[PDB]
Amino acid sequence: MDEFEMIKRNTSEIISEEELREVLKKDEKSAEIGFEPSGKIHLGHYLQIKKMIDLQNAGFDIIISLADLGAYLNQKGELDEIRKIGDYNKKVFEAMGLKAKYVYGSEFGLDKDYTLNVYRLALKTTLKRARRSMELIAREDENPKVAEVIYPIMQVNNIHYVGVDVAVGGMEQRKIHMLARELLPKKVVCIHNPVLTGLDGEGKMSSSKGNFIAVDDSPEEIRAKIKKAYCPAGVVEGNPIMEIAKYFLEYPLTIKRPEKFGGDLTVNSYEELESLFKNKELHPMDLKNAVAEELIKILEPIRKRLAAHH
Amino acid sequence: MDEFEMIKRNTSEIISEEELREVLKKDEKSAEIGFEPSGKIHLGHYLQIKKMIDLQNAGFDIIISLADLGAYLNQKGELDEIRKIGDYNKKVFEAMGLKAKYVYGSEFGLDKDYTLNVYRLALKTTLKRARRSMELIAREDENPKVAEVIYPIMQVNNIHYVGVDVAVGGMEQRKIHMLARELLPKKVVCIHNPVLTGLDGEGKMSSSKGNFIAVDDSPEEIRAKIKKAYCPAGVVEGNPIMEIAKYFLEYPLTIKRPEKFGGDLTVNSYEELESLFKNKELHPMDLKNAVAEELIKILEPIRKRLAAHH
Numbered sequence A, B: 001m002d003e004f005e006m007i008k009r010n011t012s013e014i015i016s017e018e019e020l021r022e023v024l025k026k027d028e029k030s031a032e033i034g035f036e037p038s039g040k041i042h043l044g045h046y047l048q049i050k051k052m053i054d055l056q057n058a059g060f061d062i063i064i065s066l067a068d069l070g071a072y073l074n075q076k077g078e079l080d081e082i083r084k085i086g087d088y089n090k091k092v093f094e095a096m097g098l099k100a101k102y103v104y105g106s107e108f109g110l111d112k113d114y115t116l117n118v119y120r121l122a123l124k125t126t127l128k129r130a131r132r133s134m135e136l137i138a139r140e141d142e143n144p145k146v147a148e149v150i151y152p153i154m155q156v157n158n159i160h161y162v163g164v165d166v167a168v169g170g171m172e173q174r175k176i177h178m179l180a181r182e183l184l185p186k187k188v189v190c191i192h193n194p195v196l197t198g199l200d201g202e203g204k205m206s207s208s209k210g211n212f213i214a215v216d217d218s219p220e221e222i223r224a225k226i227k228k229a230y231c232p233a234g235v236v237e238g239n240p241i242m243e244i245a246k247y248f249l250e251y252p253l254t255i256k257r258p259e260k261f262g263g264d265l266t267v268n269s270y271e272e273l274e275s276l277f278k279n280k281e282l283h284p285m286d287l288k289n290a291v292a293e294e295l296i297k298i299l300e301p302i303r304k305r306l307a308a309h310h
């Protein structure tokens, strides 16, 4: 499979594919993704970094925006604190094997020319468009504040200043990205990654207790949290354990099982694993045990790189 | 009458009087007023500059904010053009005898620290409060834009940065000023001037054709526009000619009249003039003629100062 199909793999959508094909033909091309600094870096984050690595292998220069200013506008706390967490996030992304440049929103996002462009875009953006674009991004406040409508314009302006040909993010960014394609002279090609279900089975993976696997979780934590995850027998839809098997695991894979309903089950691919689970041949307990052990191996290099840093 | 009563004269309200009395007791005190640059400087503007002169005579240091950035957010055009009109406004205010310092919103209003404070205030201001505060200031748009809710926060931030003890403006600024008293550590004392009715008798004085007397209008223009102004016999309420007689004219004043229903009418004060007009003893024609001639004399020094500048 060529660069395109590799990039397309495990994405929810590309806006547009035709535009990506044109981007691919360029000698120099860049792709950016922005993250509001987060106290835990979890598989939701890793899934997107994995896509940036794909883009990088396809000859893209990668920029990671550490969106401190954005987090500040999205009520995440004081800049000083947000920036501190941004510093930690940078180390984690680096530990994930990603070769990228890292830019803080505040690096450029408080400059005169940048700010003037925020106001210029604000002249162009309806309150209605701005508010809708934040539906999947903010909490929906009782009486929403002005900061909420400044956020999307600032994200659009960051996309402009970073200058990437491609913008990558989760499906929840799609309204901001579509706004960016209407407001900016250069239409960015948007690559959206699927939303990874939280371990609770209730909404996306997030820093809520027990709801996430952090890339630097210890093995006991990974086992404990995977053990208690939502994972009904025979149920694939909204099953976060199956999603993890789909997006992170390597195949062929052997699932260790004892003798009763055993033994070691060889699975050639995710699709084989899917059939076996839906038919209740593979029970949730064995599935979880194997995903926990594979995840430990998968995440091990990241955790040890981080620990070895003093 | 003391400084307080002089300052209070011809104002619509002071928020609050008790706070003004305290301000007055200070050795050094400042008062600011902001104007979006305007192509014509008219009696609506002059009425407020007259109040700044009063404040100045009472020992206040005066700051005039030329609100270019604000005008830009209020859709008045491009910064370059707005700033050009700002330069002309500065000359007119100077020609009005006012001793003040002049600051453009963009002088400080694009600095990092200033901008960070805009975002900080935006975190504090509901979209609902922001929008209401702009009701008497913006056009009420079909689908309002984000810029409209950035405007009031920027005006509040300017008040903070300029640092005046008093903020002066028209009654239409009252919601922004009240917001400034909630959002800033130092509560500014707000002095609001009445809204001067336009010559058309339909809403405030404004740059619409025939609706204003510009401080630098030639005498023929002043006579023509006063002649066709709204001015029903015996009607004082909403009569822009009576308002002009109230706010700009000097008394005692002699109204020139011919022999039939004559002759020269001596008026000791605005109140005398009011009674005579309501009782239809003074007809609109004689009233307009005298206001036109007095206005020509009143505005003459301003026009000639401006013309003498090359």
Ligand SMILES: COc1cc(C[C@H](N)C(=O)O)ccc1O
Residues within 6 Å of the ligand: A033, A034, A035, A036, A065, A067, A069, A070, A071, A105, A137, A151, A152, A154, A155, A156, A158, A159, A173
């Ligand atoms: C506003 O700044 C950004 C925010 C984000 C975060 C994203 N909107 C999210 O909440 O997932 C990404 C890139 C940005 O430039």
Ligand SMILES: COc1cc(C[C@H](N)C(=O)O)ccc1O
Residues within 6 Å of the ligand: B033, B034, B035, B036, B065, B067, B069, B070, B071, B105, B137, B151, B152, B154, B155, B156, B158, B159, B173
């Ligand atoms: C937003 O900037 C300002 C605007 C104005 C203009 C005022 N709001 C008006 O429209 O009359 C005054 C002072 C300011 O600092």
